[PDB]
Amino acid sequence: KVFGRCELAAAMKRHGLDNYRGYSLGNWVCAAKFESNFNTQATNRNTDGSTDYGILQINSRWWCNDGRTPGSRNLCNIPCSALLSSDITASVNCAKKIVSDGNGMNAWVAWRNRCKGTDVQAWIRGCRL
Ligand SMILES: [Cl-]
Ligand SMILES: [Cl-]
Ligand code: NA
Ligand code: NA
Structure with a gap:
């Protein structure tokens, strides 16, 4: 399924991600946009043989x-x-474990390079939440 932006924001809220470990909802939406383009089916192989x-x-x-x-x-x-x-x-339940393991959202390379330090609130602007 390819989510719309506000549809995903609402689903992530329903599942408890807004301000989880201090990360506002826009951080999670921004990370999903650049990790997967909002596509639940996305897969990508890494050099070490693992897959995302x-x-x-x-x-x-x-x-x-x-x-x-x-x-x-x-x-x-x-x-x-x-x-x-x-x-x-x-995915949400596993992400909660990841973000709690000490490094916060820095575990997601795209978040660190494309979301961290930007106006992430913009990713939820206009949405009914
Ligand atoms: Cl869902
Ligand atoms: Cl943190
Ligand atoms: Na936000
Ligand atoms: Na494994």
Whole structure:
């Protein structure tokens, strides 16, 4: 599913991401835009052989099991395919674990390079939330 901007913002609010660990909703919408273009089906392979999955591009080396990333961890205890669903629950629940692991949203490269230090509020402007 390809979300609209305000549709995704509302879904992330419903799932508890607004101000989660101090990150306002716009941060999460901005990260999703540049990680996946709001497409839950997005996948991208990394040089080390791991793969990133879903709307927030969660990596199989640490967070999910895809059956082809040797020695990796499954810290979210889920198959990576669950992160491609039109229902974002599994992606949100795993993202909450990631953002709590000490490095905050710096775990998402696109957030650090394209959202951090910008007016992220703009990503939720106009939306009914
Ligand atoms: Cl959803
Ligand atoms: Cl933080
Ligand atoms: Na915001
Ligand atoms: Na893994």
